[PDB]
Design a protein around this nucleic acid. Structure first.
Ligand SMILES: [Mg+2]
Ligand SMILES: [Mg+2]
Ligand SMILES: [Mg+2]
Ligand SMILES: [Mg+2]
Ligand SMILES: [Mg+2]
Ligand SMILES: [Mg+2]
Ligand SMILES: [Mg+2]
Ligand SMILES: [Mg+2]
Ligand SMILES: [Mg+2]
Ligand SMILES: [Mg+2]
Ligand SMILES: [Mg+2]
Ligand SMILES: [Mg+2]
Ligand SMILES: [Mg+2]
Ligand SMILES: [Mg+2]
Ligand SMILES: [Mg+2]
Ligand SMILES: [Mg+2]
Ligand SMILES: [Mg+2]
Ligand SMILES: [Mg+2]
Ligand SMILES: [Mg+2]
Ligand SMILES: [Mg+2]
Ligand SMILES: [Mg+2]
Ligand SMILES: [Mg+2]
Ligand SMILES: [Mg+2]
Ligand SMILES: [Mg+2]
Ligand SMILES: [Mg+2]
Ligand SMILES: [Mg+2]
Ligand SMILES: [Mg+2]
Ligand SMILES: [Mg+2]
Ligand SMILES: [Mg+2]
Ligand SMILES: [Mg+2]
Ligand SMILES: [Mg+2]
Ligand SMILES: [Mg+2]
Ligand SMILES: [Mg+2]
Ligand SMILES: [Mg+2]
Ligand SMILES: [Mg+2]
Ligand SMILES: [Mg+2]
Ligand SMILES: [Mg+2]
Ligand SMILES: [Mg+2]
Ligand SMILES: [Mg+2]
Ligand SMILES: [Mg+2]
Ligand SMILES: [Mg+2]
Ligand SMILES: [Mg+2]
Ligand SMILES: [Mg+2]
Ligand SMILES: [Mg+2]
Ligand SMILES: [Mg+2]
Ligand SMILES: [Mg+2]
Ligand SMILES: [Mg+2]
Ligand SMILES: [Mg+2]
Ligand SMILES: [Mg+2]
Ligand SMILES: [Mg+2]
Ligand SMILES: [Mg+2]
Ligand SMILES: [Mg+2]
Ligand SMILES: [Mg+2]
Ligand SMILES: [Mg+2]
Ligand SMILES: [Mg+2]
Ligand SMILES: [Mg+2]
Ligand SMILES: [Mg+2]
Ligand SMILES: [Mg+2]
Ligand SMILES: [Mg+2]
Ligand SMILES: [Mg+2]
Ligand SMILES: [Mg+2]
Ligand SMILES: [Mg+2]
Ligand SMILES: [Mg+2]
Ligand SMILES: [Mg+2]
Ligand SMILES: [Mg+2]
Ligand SMILES: [Mg+2]
Ligand SMILES: [Mg+2]
Ligand SMILES: [Mg+2]
Ligand SMILES: [Mg+2]
Ligand SMILES: [Mg+2]
Ligand SMILES: [Mg+2]
Ligand SMILES: [Mg+2]
Ligand SMILES: [Mg+2]
Ligand SMILES: [Mg+2]
Ligand SMILES: [Mg+2]
Ligand SMILES: [Mg+2]
Ligand SMILES: [Mg+2]
Ligand SMILES: [Mg+2]
Ligand SMILES: [Mg+2]
Ligand SMILES: [Mg+2]
Ligand SMILES: [Mg+2]
Ligand SMILES: [Mg+2]
Ligand SMILES: [Mg+2]
Ligand SMILES: [Mg+2]
Ligand SMILES: [Mg+2]
Ligand SMILES: [Mg+2]
Ligand SMILES: [Mg+2]
Ligand SMILES: [Mg+2]
Ligand SMILES: [Mg+2]
Ligand SMILES: [Mg+2]
Ligand SMILES: [Mg+2]
Ligand SMILES: [Mg+2]
Ligand SMILES: [Mg+2]
Ligand SMILES: [Mg+2]
Ligand SMILES: [Mg+2]
Ligand SMILES: [Mg+2]
Ligand SMILES: [Mg+2]
Ligand SMILES: [Mg+2]
Ligand SMILES: [Mg+2]
Ligand SMILES: [Mg+2]
Ligand SMILES: [Mg+2]
Ligand SMILES: [Mg+2]
Ligand SMILES: [Mg+2]
Ligand SMILES: [Mg+2]
Ligand SMILES: [Mg+2]
Ligand SMILES: [Mg+2]
Ligand SMILES: [Mg+2]
Ligand SMILES: [Mg+2]
Ligand SMILES: [Mg+2]
Ligand SMILES: [Mg+2]
Ligand SMILES: [Mg+2]
Ligand SMILES: [Mg+2]
Ligand SMILES: [Mg+2]
Ligand SMILES: [Mg+2]
Ligand SMILES: [Mg+2]
Ligand SMILES: [Mg+2]
Ligand SMILES: [Mg+2]
Ligand SMILES: [Mg+2]
Ligand SMILES: [Mg+2]
Ligand SMILES: [Mg+2]
Ligand SMILES: [Mg+2]
Ligand SMILES: [Mg+2]
Ligand SMILES: [Mg+2]
Ligand SMILES: [Mg+2]
Ligand SMILES: [Mg+2]
Ligand SMILES: [Mg+2]
Ligand SMILES: [Mg+2]
Ligand SMILES: [Mg+2]
Ligand SMILES: [Mg+2]
Ligand SMILES: [Mg+2]
Ligand SMILES: [Mg+2]
Ligand SMILES: [Mg+2]
Ligand SMILES: [Mg+2]
Ligand SMILES: [Mg+2]
Ligand SMILES: [Mg+2]
Ligand SMILES: [Mg+2]
Ligand SMILES: [Mg+2]
Ligand SMILES: [Mg+2]
Ligand SMILES: [Mg+2]
Ligand SMILES: [Mg+2]
Ligand SMILES: [Mg+2]
Ligand SMILES: [Mg+2]
Ligand SMILES: [Mg+2]
Ligand SMILES: [Mg+2]
Ligand SMILES: [Mg+2]
Ligand SMILES: [Mg+2]
Ligand SMILES: [Mg+2]
Ligand SMILES: [Mg+2]
Ligand SMILES: [Mg+2]
Ligand SMILES: [Mg+2]
Ligand SMILES: [Mg+2]
Ligand SMILES: [Mg+2]
Ligand SMILES: [Mg+2]
Ligand SMILES: [Mg+2]
Ligand SMILES: [Mg+2]
Ligand SMILES: [Mg+2]
Ligand SMILES: [Mg+2]
Ligand SMILES: [Mg+2]
Ligand SMILES: [Mg+2]
Ligand SMILES: [Mg+2]
Ligand SMILES: [Mg+2]
Ligand SMILES: [Mg+2]
Ligand SMILES: [Mg+2]
Ligand SMILES: [Mg+2]
Ligand SMILES: [Mg+2]
Ligand SMILES: [Mg+2]
Ligand SMILES: [Mg+2]
Ligand SMILES: [Mg+2]
Ligand SMILES: [Mg+2]
Ligand SMILES: [Mg+2]
Ligand SMILES: [Mg+2]
Ligand SMILES: [Mg+2]
Ligand SMILES: [Mg+2]
Ligand SMILES: [Mg+2]
Ligand SMILES: [Mg+2]
Ligand SMILES: [Mg+2]
Ligand SMILES: [Mg+2]
Ligand SMILES: [Mg+2]
Ligand SMILES: [Mg+2]
Ligand SMILES: [Mg+2]
Ligand SMILES: [Mg+2]
Ligand SMILES: [Mg+2]
Ligand SMILES: [Mg+2]
Ligand SMILES: [Mg+2]
Ligand SMILES: [Mg+2]
Ligand SMILES: [Mg+2]
Ligand SMILES: [Mg+2]
Ligand SMILES: [Mg+2]
Ligand SMILES: [Mg+2]
Ligand SMILES: [Mg+2]
Ligand SMILES: [Mg+2]
Ligand SMILES: [Mg+2]
Ligand SMILES: [Mg+2]
Ligand SMILES: [Mg+2]
Ligand SMILES: [Mg+2]
Ligand SMILES: [Mg+2]
Ligand SMILES: [Mg+2]
Ligand SMILES: [Mg+2]
Ligand SMILES: [Mg+2]
Ligand SMILES: [Mg+2]
Ligand SMILES: [Mg+2]
Ligand SMILES: [Mg+2]
Ligand SMILES: [Mg+2]
Ligand SMILES: [Mg+2]
Ligand SMILES: [Mg+2]
Ligand SMILES: [Mg+2]
Ligand SMILES: [Mg+2]
Ligand SMILES: [Mg+2]
Ligand SMILES: [Mg+2]
Ligand SMILES: [Mg+2]
Ligand SMILES: [Mg+2]
Ligand SMILES: [Mg+2]
Ligand SMILES: [Mg+2]
Ligand SMILES: [Mg+2]
Ligand SMILES: [Mg+2]
Ligand SMILES: [Mg+2]
Ligand SMILES: [Mg+2]
Ligand SMILES: [Mg+2]
Ligand SMILES: [Mg+2]
Ligand SMILES: [Mg+2]
Ligand SMILES: [Mg+2]
Ligand SMILES: [Mg+2]
Ligand SMILES: [Mg+2]
Ligand SMILES: [Mg+2]
Ligand SMILES: [Mg+2]
Ligand SMILES: [Mg+2]
Ligand SMILES: [Mg+2]
Ligand SMILES: [Mg+2]
Ligand SMILES: [Mg+2]
Ligand SMILES: [Mg+2]
Ligand SMILES: [Mg+2]
Ligand SMILES: [Mg+2]
Ligand SMILES: [Mg+2]
Ligand SMILES: [Mg+2]
Ligand SMILES: [Mg+2]
Ligand SMILES: [Mg+2]
Ligand SMILES: [Mg+2]
Ligand SMILES: [Mg+2]
Ligand SMILES: [Mg+2]
Ligand SMILES: [Mg+2]
Ligand SMILES: [Mg+2]
Ligand SMILES: [Mg+2]
Ligand SMILES: [Mg+2]
Ligand SMILES: [Mg+2]
Ligand SMILES: [Mg+2]
Ligand SMILES: [Mg+2]
Ligand SMILES: [Mg+2]
Ligand SMILES: [Mg+2]
Ligand SMILES: [Mg+2]
Ligand SMILES: [Mg+2]
Ligand SMILES: [Mg+2]
Ligand SMILES: [Mg+2]
Ligand SMILES: [Mg+2]
Ligand SMILES: [Mg+2]
Ligand SMILES: [Mg+2]
Ligand SMILES: [Mg+2]
Ligand SMILES: [Mg+2]
Ligand SMILES: [Mg+2]
Ligand SMILES: [Mg+2]
Ligand SMILES: [Mg+2]
Ligand SMILES: [Mg+2]
Ligand SMILES: [Mg+2]
Ligand SMILES: [Mg+2]
Ligand SMILES: [Zn+2]
Lengths: 107, 51, 64
RNA sequence: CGGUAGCGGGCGUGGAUCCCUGGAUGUCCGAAUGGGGGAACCCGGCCGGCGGGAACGCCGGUCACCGCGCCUUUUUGCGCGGGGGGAACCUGGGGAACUGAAACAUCUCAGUACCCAGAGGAGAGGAAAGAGAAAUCGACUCCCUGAGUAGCGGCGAGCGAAAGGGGACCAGCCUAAACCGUCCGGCUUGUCCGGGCGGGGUCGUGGGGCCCUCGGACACCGAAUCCCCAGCCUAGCCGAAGCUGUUGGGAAGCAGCGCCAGAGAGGGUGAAAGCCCCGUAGGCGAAAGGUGGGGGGAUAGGUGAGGGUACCCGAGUACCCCGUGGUUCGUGGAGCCAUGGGGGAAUCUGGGCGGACCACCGCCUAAGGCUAAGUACUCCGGGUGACCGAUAGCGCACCAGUACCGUGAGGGAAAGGUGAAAAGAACCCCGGGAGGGGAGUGAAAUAGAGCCUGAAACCGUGGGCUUACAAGCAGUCACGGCCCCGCAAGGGGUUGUGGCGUGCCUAUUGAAGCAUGAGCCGGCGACUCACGGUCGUGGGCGAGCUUAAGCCGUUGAGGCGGAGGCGUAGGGAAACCGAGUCCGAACAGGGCGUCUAGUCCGCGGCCGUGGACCCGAAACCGGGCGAGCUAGCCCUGGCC
RNA sequence: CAGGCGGUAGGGGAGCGUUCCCGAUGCCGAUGAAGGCCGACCCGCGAGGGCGGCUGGAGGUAAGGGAAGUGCGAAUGCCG
RNA sequence: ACCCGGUGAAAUUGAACUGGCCGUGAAGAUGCGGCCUACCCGUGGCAGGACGAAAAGACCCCGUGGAGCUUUACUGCAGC
């Protein structure tokens, strides 16, 4: 029974805390084992790389460091506000995620 | 001592007997309503003893 | 564990109402042919143990 | 697509990884089971298969032993079963010594440690040849009590019951024998004997058999056995409510206004979050497997009253004796239960027992077996701590029963922490490298990986004061000088000369002692706890005080429970009498008593028993491990 | 006001500090917890307790009570 | 052995700013007294002292300690 991530790739989410409090981005990737997410263009850092086949000019590269999955919040496709995931059993059977604020389907 | 404890609270005046709590059908806000009326604004701690 | 009564004391001695400790006079078990009547008589009685040894014996009879 | 990045390739809404349930596969060793063997390797028989397959090899199957059914033509076959492991707990067979007794032998330690066999989630025990004094109880086990009583005891050290009462649990059954039936065998041929099977039978108001009489045989009871179900376990799921401002590297902080609450447990998130995340309260959940001590169904089974008869009612048994064990019982007046030896009955008008023996009065029915629950334990799962926090807590938080030591049995460590995030320092410079200096990342690099904090011993660099005609437990008092902080006056550091000056601990009549202990620093390090006593003390109640186990409630809530314990009477070896009583002929005289105060809880001091303030023997005992060193011998070789 | 106040074994009395509990869903804390390093300062007879500067970086625990693995310099102690 | 380059232990160690004489003192003093002597620091050497190191004296005694051995010590067991 895997880690219970409240957000998937690539949801559109709000970086709700940290240095990037306020930013908005698509969930580029999820890392459940480490309980983290990577949001595009967020939490970027200046990694040094030795001169290589890949990096002949060497120097630095930029890359998005994973944020703690907790710091990130799903945004509603409907009301556009950041929300809290809510579970809703459909008519037929299998369940979906819905916006606790309004009620819209998160998809 | 049990009698003596209720006594200390009697003399202070901080003992109140009620025959029933009216609005409370189960929810916390219901008690909060009722408590307001008994003058339990929650500026002081309360032991609530009831079956 | 709980204390045991010293049966040796229990068989030789008594605690009176006030906690005095009495025993039989020693010295009459035998060799009496030449003991005077007075001596055999006076040894027939009980006597109260001296306080120090008395209070040691009372400790030995704790449920007494 | 484990820890795990890397190189190199894949998979997933056609529902992957992952979690649960049930399958499949499962080399070799191990009870180890075809045989051998120095475990993990070596060699086979029978039957099939494979390769060109005769030889050779591989593959599949099969072949150990013991017990019972002997169903087996003994031979031969078949069938069910056993073996080995398990943390502790359990029963049984055997069974120490140190120690205590201030020596020691009886005794104690103790039927303990330990060895061995066996049982199972428990095991043991268990439906009276009981208890033991009441005209009583009614299987066993477990807890409280009775009780440190009765007793046992070099009557020393010490040991130490039972009945009764209060509770937990609750449950009772099957046979042997008479007698009927049948079946194979006997040859003393038979109303006979023996073995098997079925029926019958199950006892202490004594029962049962067989013959006679009424009843009912369709009434009733009813599993500990079987069937079904609820419920439970082994994956999961739903689950209320926060915005904005602000300081900050970061908000959960501060400020403003809100909301939820059967949820304000807790953990996480860059710091301190009921409303961000996982959750929490409250609910919902299984196709499959396990359980099912609750609910329902069935089956096995089980049930009367008289009269007669005198057929049966567990044998080397009871019983007696000798030698012992058990019990509180140590030979004691020594019963009772058990039995190694000898003698050796009876079938109810019989036997055993109520502490020698006898009489009386009673209790019980031996010499066959089964039985749940209440109880014990903790390898394992969960929950919780006025439990530990890396020298602690398990030996082990980490690659630990490891490294290492030891022939072996066996011994047995040390070792946790960058950061919120690897952003883990490109690039330049010195250098063979190591290591550094710039740069860069970060809030912080005096977080740089030999990474949080970073004390002390210990080692250096720099500065102030000081020191080469003074001899000293190293300090101290004074004065003076220099350097420093100070408006002032005052102070800090250092020490030239003057005064005075026998380290610390322990052990001691006495130590600076040429008596003991300590290189120095850091950390670990010794009067506790339980039960029972005796005083003091803070309280509660008072001629009364008080509950124990347990039951109910809770889930950091208490209540119930009076059995029992102390006290309200003492004296006496006792019978016994009683404000008295004992010795005594006493109506002398003495002794011990009377002339009320206790009891429960907490705290403190001390005492008894426990290792009892901590560390230390030489030794004694149990069970294993060692003749790869050494001693001797046995077998087979070699050397001079 | 008067008198007493050397002290080993030992007896008595009053306190200081360590860990933990209640007090706490509290209060202190990144405007800096604990711990560390200094000090010629304050309070206390003393054990101590404060205050200030530096370090440190996430905890702390009041008044009043409760409980103990509670204080080291020596054990040819133990570990480093 | 000594000197230079390289590597680099140990027992021991309360701390030391560690002189002689005559006294003294638990009776054998670098450490107490009074005198005498001595500029500061080393290197190669000798062993008189530090009652030098090492080993909680093996001698001796003590402990109602241990063990091995003996016998016409006591009690017991095997064996006969
Ligand atoms: Mg960066
Ligand atoms: Mg929600
Ligand atoms: Mg005792
Ligand atoms: Mg005795
Ligand atoms: Mg005696
Ligand atoms: Mg007396
Ligand atoms: Mg005479
Ligand atoms: Mg006389
Ligand atoms: Mg007295
Ligand atoms: Mg007493
Ligand atoms: Mg691993
Ligand atoms: Mg990988
Ligand atoms: Mg791998
Ligand atoms: Mg690779
Ligand atoms: Mg690649
Ligand atoms: Mg599916
Ligand atoms: Mg295997
Ligand atoms: Mg074999
Ligand atoms: Mg086989
Ligand atoms: Mg072989
Ligand atoms: Mg062959
Ligand atoms: Mg074969
Ligand atoms: Mg046949
Ligand atoms: Mg046969
Ligand atoms: Mg046969
Ligand atoms: Mg079969
Ligand atoms: Mg078995
Ligand atoms: Mg076995
Ligand atoms: Mg047996
Ligand atoms: Mg045994
Ligand atoms: Mg046996
Ligand atoms: Mg002995
Ligand atoms: Mg003793
Ligand atoms: Mg002894
Ligand atoms: Mg002794
Ligand atoms: Mg003992
Ligand atoms: Mg035995
Ligand atoms: Mg016993
Ligand atoms: Mg035992
Ligand atoms: Mg069970
Ligand atoms: Mg049981
Ligand atoms: Mg059970
Ligand atoms: Mg059982
Ligand atoms: Mg049985
Ligand atoms: Mg039985
Ligand atoms: Mg009966
Ligand atoms: Mg009797
Ligand atoms: Mg009666
Ligand atoms: Mg009677
Ligand atoms: Mg009666
Ligand atoms: Mg009767
Ligand atoms: Mg004894
Ligand atoms: Mg006894
Ligand atoms: Mg005994
Ligand atoms: Mg005995
Ligand atoms: Mg007993
Ligand atoms: Mg008896
Ligand atoms: Mg009883
Ligand atoms: Mg009762
Ligand atoms: Mg009972
Ligand atoms: Mg119970
Ligand atoms: Mg019953
Ligand atoms: Mg039958
Ligand atoms: Mg028979
Ligand atoms: Mg015939
Ligand atoms: Mg015939
Ligand atoms: Mg048959
Ligand atoms: Mg039969
Ligand atoms: Mg029959
Ligand atoms: Mg029958
Ligand atoms: Mg009878
Ligand atoms: Mg009859
Ligand atoms: Mg009859
Ligand atoms: Mg008739
Ligand atoms: Mg009739
Ligand atoms: Mg009728
Ligand atoms: Mg009917
Ligand atoms: Mg049933
Ligand atoms: Mg499951
Ligand atoms: Mg569940
Ligand atoms: Mg949820
Ligand atoms: Mg929620
Ligand atoms: Mg603030
Ligand atoms: Mg809660
Ligand atoms: Mg709480
Ligand atoms: Mg927020
Ligand atoms: Mg979860
Ligand atoms: Mg939970
Ligand atoms: Mg609950
Ligand atoms: Mg509900
Ligand atoms: Mg739930
Ligand atoms: Mg199912
Ligand atoms: Mg099922
Ligand atoms: Mg299962
Ligand atoms: Mg069960
Ligand atoms: Mg089921
Ligand atoms: Mg049932
Ligand atoms: Mg039916
Ligand atoms: Mg029937
Ligand atoms: Mg009948
Ligand atoms: Mg017979
Ligand atoms: Mg016989
Ligand atoms: Mg007999
Ligand atoms: Mg006998
Ligand atoms: Mg026996
Ligand atoms: Mg005996
Ligand atoms: Mg016994
Ligand atoms: Mg006996
Ligand atoms: Mg006797
Ligand atoms: Mg006897
Ligand atoms: Mg008899
Ligand atoms: Mg016997
Ligand atoms: Mg016999
Ligand atoms: Mg007879
Ligand atoms: Mg006869
Ligand atoms: Mg009879
Ligand atoms: Mg009897
Ligand atoms: Mg009798
Ligand atoms: Mg007789
Ligand atoms: Mg009887
Ligand atoms: Mg029987
Ligand atoms: Mg049983
Ligand atoms: Mg567990
Ligand atoms: Mg647990
Ligand atoms: Mg702690
Ligand atoms: Mg450590
Ligand atoms: Mg640490
Ligand atoms: Mg460490
Ligand atoms: Mg360590
Ligand atoms: Mg463990
Ligand atoms: Mg690990
Ligand atoms: Mg490991
Ligand atoms: Mg281990
Ligand atoms: Mg391991
Ligand atoms: Mg070693
Ligand atoms: Mg890390
Ligand atoms: Mg970390
Ligand atoms: Mg660098
Ligand atoms: Mg270079
Ligand atoms: Mg080279
Ligand atoms: Mg830099
Ligand atoms: Mg920089
Ligand atoms: Mg910073
Ligand atoms: Mg800095
Ligand atoms: Mg690293
Ligand atoms: Mg790392
Ligand atoms: Mg390193
Ligand atoms: Mg290195
Ligand atoms: Mg270090
Ligand atoms: Mg350092
Ligand atoms: Mg300079
Ligand atoms: Mg200097
Ligand atoms: Mg001069
Ligand atoms: Mg001076
Ligand atoms: Mg001057
Ligand atoms: Mg100058
Ligand atoms: Mg200067
Ligand atoms: Mg200065
Ligand atoms: Mg100034
Ligand atoms: Mg100035
Ligand atoms: Mg001045
Ligand atoms: Mg000065
Ligand atoms: Mg000076
Ligand atoms: Mg001066
Ligand atoms: Mg001087
Ligand atoms: Mg002196
Ligand atoms: Mg010493
Ligand atoms: Mg002296
Ligand atoms: Mg000395
Ligand atoms: Mg001397
Ligand atoms: Mg000496
Ligand atoms: Mg000495
Ligand atoms: Mg030392
Ligand atoms: Mg030392
Ligand atoms: Mg020394
Ligand atoms: Mg050393
Ligand atoms: Mg201590
Ligand atoms: Mg003491
Ligand atoms: Mg004490
Ligand atoms: Mg203590
Ligand atoms: Mg006590
Ligand atoms: Mg007294
Ligand atoms: Mg008291
Ligand atoms: Mg009182
Ligand atoms: Mg009790
Ligand atoms: Mg409840
Ligand atoms: Mg309960
Ligand atoms: Mg709790
Ligand atoms: Mg709790
Ligand atoms: Mg209770
Ligand atoms: Mg009692
Ligand atoms: Mg009489
Ligand atoms: Mg009388
Ligand atoms: Mg009178
Ligand atoms: Mg008379
Ligand atoms: Mg007279
Ligand atoms: Mg008179
Ligand atoms: Mg007189
Ligand atoms: Mg009189
Ligand atoms: Mg009088
Ligand atoms: Mg009176
Ligand atoms: Mg009077
Ligand atoms: Mg009185
Ligand atoms: Mg006491
Ligand atoms: Mg004693
Ligand atoms: Mg000991
Ligand atoms: Mg003690
Ligand atoms: Mg004691
Ligand atoms: Mg011995
Ligand atoms: Mg020996
Ligand atoms: Mg061997
Ligand atoms: Mg050899
Ligand atoms: Mg040869
Ligand atoms: Mg030759
Ligand atoms: Mg004080
Ligand atoms: Mg709290
Ligand atoms: Mg708190
Ligand atoms: Mg809270
Ligand atoms: Mg407060
Ligand atoms: Mg900050
Ligand atoms: Mg501030
Ligand atoms: Mg600061
Ligand atoms: Mg310093
Ligand atoms: Mg200052
Ligand atoms: Mg002051
Ligand atoms: Mg304070
Ligand atoms: Mg202060
Ligand atoms: Mg700072
Ligand atoms: Mg600080
Ligand atoms: Mg932090
Ligand atoms: Mg406190
Ligand atoms: Mg505070
Ligand atoms: Mg306080
Ligand atoms: Mg306090
Ligand atoms: Mg309190
Ligand atoms: Mg306190
Ligand atoms: Mg301690
Ligand atoms: Mg010490
Ligand atoms: Mg030391
Ligand atoms: Mg040493
Ligand atoms: Mg060491
Ligand atoms: Mg050492
Ligand atoms: Mg260490
Ligand atoms: Mg050391
Ligand atoms: Mg030379
Ligand atoms: Mg040279
Ligand atoms: Mg050299
Ligand atoms: Mg010095
Ligand atoms: Mg001399
Ligand atoms: Mg001198
Ligand atoms: Mg010296
Ligand atoms: Mg002097
Ligand atoms: Mg001198
Ligand atoms: Mg030189
Ligand atoms: Mg040299
Ligand atoms: Mg020289
Ligand atoms: Mg010399
Ligand atoms: Mg020696
Ligand atoms: Mg000699
Ligand atoms: Mg001794
Ligand atoms: Mg002696
Ligand atoms: Mg002696
Ligand atoms: Mg000797
Ligand atoms: Zn919405």
């Amino acid at each position: 029974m895997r880690v219970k991530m409240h957000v998937k790739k690539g949801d559109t989410v709000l970086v709700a805390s940290g240095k990037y409090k306020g930013r908005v981005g698509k969930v580029k990737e999820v890392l459940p084992k480490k309980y983290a997410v990577i949001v595009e263009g967020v939490n970027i850092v200046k990694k040094a790389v030795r001169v290589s086949p890949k990096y002949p000019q060497g120097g630095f590269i930029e890359k998005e460091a994973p944020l703690h999955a907790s710091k990130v919040r799903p945004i509603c496709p409907a009301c556009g506000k950041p929300t809290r995931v809510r579970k809703k059993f459909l008519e037929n059977g299998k369940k979906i995620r819905v916006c606790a604020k309004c009620g819209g389907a998160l998809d | 001592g049990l009698a003596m404890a209720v006594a200390d609270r009697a003399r202070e005046g901080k003992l109140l007997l009620v025959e029933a709590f009216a609005g409370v059908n189960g929810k916390t806000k219901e008690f909060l309503a009722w408590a307001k009326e008994a003058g339990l604004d929650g500026s002081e701690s309360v032991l609530l003893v009831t079956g | 564990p709980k204390m045991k009564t010293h049966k040796g004391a229990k068989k030789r001695v008594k605690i009176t109402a006030s906690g005095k400790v009495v025993a039989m006079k020693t010295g009459k078990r035998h060799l009496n042919w030449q003991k005077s009547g007075k001596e055999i008589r006076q040894k027939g009685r009980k006597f109260v143990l001296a306080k120090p040894e008395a209070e040691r014996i009372k400790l030995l009879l704790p449920y007494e």
